Amino acid sequence: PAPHGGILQDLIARDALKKNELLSEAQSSDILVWNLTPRQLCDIELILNGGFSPLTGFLNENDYSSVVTDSRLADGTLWTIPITLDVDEAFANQIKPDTRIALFQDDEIPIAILTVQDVYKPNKTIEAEKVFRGDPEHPAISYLFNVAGDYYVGGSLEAIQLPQHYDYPGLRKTPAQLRLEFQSRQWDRVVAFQTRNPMHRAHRELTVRAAREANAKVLIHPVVGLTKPGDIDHHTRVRVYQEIIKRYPNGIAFLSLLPLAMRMSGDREAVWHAIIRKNYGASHFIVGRDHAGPGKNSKGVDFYGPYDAQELVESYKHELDIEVVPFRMVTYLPDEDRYAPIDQIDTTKTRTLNISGTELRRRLRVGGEIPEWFSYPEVVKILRESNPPRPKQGFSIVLGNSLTVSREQLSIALLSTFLQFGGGRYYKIFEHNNKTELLSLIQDFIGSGSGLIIPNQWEDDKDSVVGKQNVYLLDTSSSADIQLESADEPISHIVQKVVLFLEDNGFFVF
Amino acid sequence: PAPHGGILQDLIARDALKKNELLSEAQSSDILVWNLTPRQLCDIELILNGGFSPLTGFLNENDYSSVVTDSRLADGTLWTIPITLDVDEAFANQIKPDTRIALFQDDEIPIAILTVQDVYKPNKTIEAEKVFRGDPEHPAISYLFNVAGDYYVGGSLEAIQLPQHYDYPGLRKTPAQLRLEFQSRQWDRVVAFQTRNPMHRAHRELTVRAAREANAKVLIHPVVGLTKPGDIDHHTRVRVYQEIIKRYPNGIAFLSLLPLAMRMSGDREAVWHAIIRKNYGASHFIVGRDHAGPGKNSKGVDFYGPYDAQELVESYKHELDIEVVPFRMVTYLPDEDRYAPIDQIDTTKTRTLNISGTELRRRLRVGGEIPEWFSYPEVVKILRESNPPRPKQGFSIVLGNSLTVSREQLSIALLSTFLQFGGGRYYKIFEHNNKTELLSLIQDFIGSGSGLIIPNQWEDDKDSVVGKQNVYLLDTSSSADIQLESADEPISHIVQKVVLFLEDNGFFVF
Ligand SMILES: [Ca+2]
Ligand SMILES: [Ca+2]
Ligand SMILES: [Ca+2]
Ligand SMILES: [Ca+2]
Ligand SMILES: [Ca+2]
Ligand SMILES: [Ca+2]
Ligand SMILES: [Mg+2]
Ligand SMILES: [Mg+2]
Ligand code: NA
Ligand code: NA
Ligand code: NA
Ligand code: NA
Ligand code: NA
Ligand code: NA
């Protein structure tokens, strides 16, 4: 269907003949520069390539306010997620309306020139409540307060070039490009599938049934910008998509990556996804259970109800101009060797099997088997590689502050001991000297599968620098992972405690 | 580089706003229609999509003659293979210059309107000698005399649509389309690889080295129109390409299909391939040993010298405007587990292994093993499927005219006997009654793996209707595949002769 607002605002194409001129202005000595944050790069790419039609810049306060309370742009155009350029006070003060500023990437690549319409300090409590529902634990609110700038700069954009990406150049289709790809194949009915996760047999099955019921071709449009915190990296995920797309019948599916920065804003985001896919050329879209929802908070309560998304999108059905296909999740029937829509089988009368994310995570952590009815083997092989089991995981042993035995000798004892065991893990007694440049290397070593022995703890005002994954404290204190019987426990006893701890946790296997 | 002649003659785009008008004219009652032959569909698709720039129609006699003797269009543009619309006398007579005729596909799909410039009867002996070197066994000369019409119609083309194809819609990129695909990936150095065969490890290796030496991305551009007689079907081949393209390092290669009708015209064709790839957007091209050559004739003599192609292309180097990368064939070194350029190793000092086409064919016929150093397993699996070994091959036993035993009983005996054996082959006593509609089904059954028992021979004026592959004559005559001791040999003896013959030939395995 036609782009939201009727026109594809592909600013790259619009400004093609001003590229040199704009590029030269961006590189002028007198122009004020702003370095785009990683989320802003995600947003500006979608504005510049028309992914966010009718947007043609970051929202000024007039539009922003309507989006916050009315879920629309001041002109009444449905638009549920505010896209603004958040800056700090120091920069906001240097700019006034009509000021033209340059937006760079990595402090070296000019992306666009923004003509300032306004500068304002939004009430983040209202946005937090109105747009994201108010739970301080909602990733969007966390970002809203802890990362986002306190001042929004609204203004019209002029394009120099889209944010630079060196990976998957072939798959990052812009709206215009994707539309031409469909057009060259004569596809005029396309159902799009959103995801920020690996795809298993069930996803393959459900998307194909969608294709069959909507009489449409399939578009697997995964998000590769910012997704939920803790999600699997997009490189791993792209590898999985590239693998699963080969499992569809020839000529029925197309894989294209979307550099979107999700807010995990549930029902509002679901609407936004529909609009965005319409701009990219899809005729149909599937909205899932708790679509774009971040789940439950600490108190175990739902950030959104499982059907809020589908209900909200349905309420805007008459103006979305993109058909929404009903979400029919499928489950595996052992006794019939097939998948079937969950709404068609009687739980208490028919056998069904499925592997929850929690269980999948466990199996991967212990190197256990994962059945082909759940996920294709080539897909599982990829997941095991990016997330190796414990015998292949790195780790660190931190000699606590309470230790009175010789740190130099205990570290040497641990090294010599670990080195006896096989498995190929690399070991290092690592001294950081409380230097940040060294502390930041700890998780890289662990990520590399290495075993580090750290002679002493770093200062508390440095915790933030070190990731806590697979990092274990050896100390007399109660908060120690490997508790010492006493501060002067004999080195050989300590060594045993560590070895058996690592064994119990799967790092060593004999 | 720029299209040959400087302009991409994409007539589909040129005539976009006349499509309805032209379509309506093509469907008029008074317009004279011509049904395009399968080769003409191959040629018109390349003319219409700019693949043959600067051509904009089929060659008139003025241009055709220059191509025949001068290897150029009358304007002096390098062009080595004549592309003409060959028709029979009955049609040629109905047309005069300025006559507008419609060119259809399958007698139902209008492709273009041709404005006749001239009608002429070419001297096919000169073309045969000058363009194709004169050997009556050259596939182009065979076609030239036995299939091609005796009258050439020269004229300008106007596009309605490209020849319809329902398979691989995604991979059939036109010149403009491919150029945009390279442009979107920022590829400006692309080396193209021509082929009408399956690709094995050696081809993968040599194309990647080409990429490394030319500092270019790779374009695997296989021909899927008409290639050499006896070649493997393009469906099988496309399956292989789609498989091998996955073996290149990510982002280095692109697969696009070329609907060219090869003439197997060696050095002239090599030049033509360079021009064509330049039009499709390649900056580089590899010309191989005996490139586009059909091999040797009956007397075992070479249709072309192995380096005629490379030498001819090199002589036109200063006007081709596309770099030709030297052809460095590679061979496998067992002792080093690697492939290396054949021009770098000493045959008598270093071990090298390779599997000729003949040997590959044998292994496939007997279901023998084919090593991974030769071809990737997923590629070999595909070849085995399209070309199954003898235990999975169909066949036919024809009861010769010399037989005096009861044909009804011998056929029944053979059936009952074959049915004892396992293997899943399907059997049928097939009566054709000398009817063409039934005879043409024989190879379909054999192609399906079936075993047919044919009670009597068909008339000689029908031989042509039946393919001779895996068809065996049971007769007393000397020209019989399974020779009877006598015309009245006992049925049980005959049955044994047939069973043991089929066993010796691998159809049955116990
Ligand atoms: Ca703040
Ligand atoms: Ca719930
Ligand atoms: Ca003590
Ligand atoms: Ca003739
Ligand atoms: Ca030779
Ligand atoms: Ca007798
Ligand atoms: Mg980009
Ligand atoms: Mg076509
Ligand atoms: Na519409
Ligand atoms: Na999913
Ligand atoms: Na609710
Ligand atoms: Na040039
Ligand atoms: Na080849
Ligand atoms: Na020669």
Curated annotation (Swiss-Prot), chains A, B:
- Where is the protein situated, by its record's location annotation? Cytoplasm
Identify the EC number(s).
2.7.7.4
Region annotation Catalytic: residue ranges?
167-392
Pathway note: Sulfur metabolism; hydrogen sulfide biosynthesis; sulfite from sulfate: step 1/3
Site annotation (Transition state stabilizer) points to H200, H203
**Binding-site residues, sulfate:** Q194, R196, A292
Reaction catalyzed: sulfate + ATP + H(+) = adenosine 5'-phosphosulfate + diphosphate
| Site feature (Induces change in substrate recognition on ATP binding) residues | F327
List the induction conditions. Answer: Expression depends on the formation of the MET4-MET28-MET31 and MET4-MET28-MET32 complexes on its 5' upstream region.
Q: Where is this region: Required for oligomerization?
A: 393-510
Q: Where is this region: N-terminal?
A: 1-166
Residue positions of the active site: T195, R196, N197
Picking any one GO biological process from the record gives: hydrogen sulfide biosynthetic process
Keyword field contains ATP-binding: yes
What domain of life does the native source organism fall in?
A: Eukaryota
Q: Which UniProt keywords apply?
A: ATP-binding, Cytoplasm, Nucleotide-binding, Nucleotidyltransferase, Transferase
> What InterPro entries does the entry give?
ATP-Sase_PUA-like_dom (IPR025980), P-loop_NTPase (IPR027417), PUA-like_sf (IPR015947), Rossmann-like_a/b/a_fold (IPR014729), Sulf_adenylyltr_euk (IPR027535), Sulf_AdTrans/APS_kinase (IPR050512), Sulfurylase_cat_dom (IPR024951), Sulphate_adenylyltransferase (IPR002650)
> Under the GO molecular function aspect, what terms does this record hold?
ATP binding; sulfate adenylyltransferase (ATP) activity
The residues listed in the UniProt record as binding ATP, with positions renumbered to this chain, are: Q194, T195, R196, N197, G288, R289, D290, H291, V330
State the family it belongs to.
Belongs to the sulfate adenylyltransferase family.
- Binding partners and assembly: Homohexamer. Dimer of trimers.
- Comment field on protein domains: The oligomerization domain is distantly related to APS kinases, but it is not functional and does not bind APS. It is required for oligomerization of the enzyme, although the oligomerization state has no effect on the catalytic activity of the enzyme.
NCBIfam families, per this entry?
A: sopT
User: Which PANTHER family does this chain map to?
Assistant: SULFATE ADENYLYLTRANSFERASE
Q: What else is known?
A: Present with 1510 molecules/cell in log phase SD medium.
What is the protein's name according to its record? Sulfate adenylyltransferase
Q: Which organism is it from?
A: Saccharomyces cerevisiae (strain ATCC 204508 / S288c) (Baker's yeast)
